[PDB]
Design a protein around this ligand. Structure first.
Ligand SMILES: N#Cc1cnn2c(Nc3ccc4c(c3)CC(=O)N4)cc(Cl)nc12
Ligand SMILES: N#Cc1cnn2c(Nc3ccc4c(c3)CC(=O)N4)cc(Cl)nc12
Ligand SMILES: [Cl-]
Ligand SMILES: [Cl-]
Lengths: 123, 4, 123, 4
């Protein structure tokens, strides 16, 4: 018999992104080649099958630094991290291949899906 | 607010 | 020029609630009289003006235990904590006064609004 | 997916 506030989930995510911008309560740095990205482990796990696996691991859960595979593109990761915190994906002709490869590695199935559909339309 |  | 995934914010919140149920990465216990509630500080801040103020404080941000005012009803807090993590509010005739008082203390304006409207309709 |  609950009632539901339609905008609540979006409002929560907006405040989680505000916390990220201000670097409040961030508990991990994701290292992608020469670049560093601060984030909240809980948000990363909530969005990515890879981070969900990493941070449920009894040893990796306590690491403050995670290094991604050297093949991962920093811009692709940046675009996906922005998506995690906003629901918005900056998908462009010049970045789609890097975004799709990063989304496959991060196990973000909905992003992979759409990248596949956008590539298929251009061929 | 809505009835879900 | 971004595209947006409609269900993303709801999916994030569902996984944050799964983390709470499994007690993964919870970093605070909220003590309400004889009862204890484990939660994620980031979610509490994202939902409540009171917790936002508490956890941006340079000393309180590092506390693992927060004790609420003894006038706060544990069931009212439980209902509001469930709302924070799900967007669903278990508002009933028998609990509405406790829910509204707890929402005023926690500074959760949308919940206060609706409690006010539901009480006005019954008078 | 939508155009926001
Ligand atoms: N507890 C918990 C919890 C925290 N996070 N999380 C999940 N995170 C996840 C796992 C796989 C995938 C995605 C997110 C997006 C995607 O494409 N695949 C799943 C579950 Cl079943 N549970 C949890
Ligand atoms: N950074 C950050 C950040 C984390 N959380 N958070 C806010 N949390 C909040 C503050 C006040 C109220 C509510 C939520 C619900 C309500 O009724 N009032 C606000 C801002 Cl402006 N910023 C942030
Ligand atoms: Cl996804
Ligand atoms: Cl609210």
């Amino acid at each position: 018999s609950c009632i539901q506030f339609t905008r609540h989930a979006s409002d929560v995510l907006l405040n989680l992104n505000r916390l990220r911008s201000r670097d409040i309560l961030t508990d991990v740095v994701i290292v992608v080649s020469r670049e560093q990205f601060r984030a909240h482990k809980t948000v990363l796990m909530a969005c990515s099958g890879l981070f969900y696996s990493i941070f449920t691991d009894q040893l990796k859960c306590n690491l403050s630094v995670i290094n991604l595979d050297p093949e991962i593109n920093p811009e692709g990761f940046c675009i996906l991290l922005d998506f995690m915190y906003t629901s918005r994906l900056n998908l462009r002709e010049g970045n789609i291949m890097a975004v799709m490869a990063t989304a496959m590695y991060l196990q973000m199935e909905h992003v992979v899906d759409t990248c596949r559909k956008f590539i298929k339309a251009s061929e | 607010w809505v009835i879900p």
